[PDB]
Symmetry: C2
Subunit: 103 residues, 2 copies
């Protein structure tokens, strides 16, 4: 029921006394540009994106120091997973999970 523009990468957020405009591009062809005008912007960008230097998203005017300083101090961690698909089960099905100790 929501209006969602997929494949739309925000590039710049402009926020002013009179309103906001958000500049985004098509991810499938980055030349194609869109300008979304609104009363307010809700930023949901991951902290990792906000941390990115040089910026992946530019804020105009620049965010105040008390905001940027916080973005720098906070940690943004990492963890990954490997999916292994087999045709046969060869492990104990009753065991939800088991470990492996490193050398």
């Amino acid at each position: 029921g929501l209006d969602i523009k997929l494949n739309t990468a925000v590039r710049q957020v402009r926020y002013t006394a009179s309103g906001c405009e958000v500049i985004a591009v098509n991810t499938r062809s980055t030349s194609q540009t869109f300008i979304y005008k609104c009363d307010a912007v809700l930023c949901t960008l991951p902290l990792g994106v906000l941390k990115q230097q040089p910026p992946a998203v530019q804020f105009v005017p620049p965010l105040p120091e008390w905001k940027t300083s916080a973005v720098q101090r906070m940690g943004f961690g990492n963890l990954n997973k490997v999916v292994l698909c087999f045709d046969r089960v060869f492990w104990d099905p009753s065991v939800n999970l088991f470990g492996h100790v490193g050398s």
Copy 2:
């Protein structure tokens, strides 16, 4: 004596009743965006570009 922004590729020209805004990018890093606001735009783009 002129103000020239080199390495600035215009991507979109917006022209309205109240004025114009021109969206351009840095050719050396196309993520970096600029919005130039003005009363009028003079288009000097080659016919080949306009045909593209």
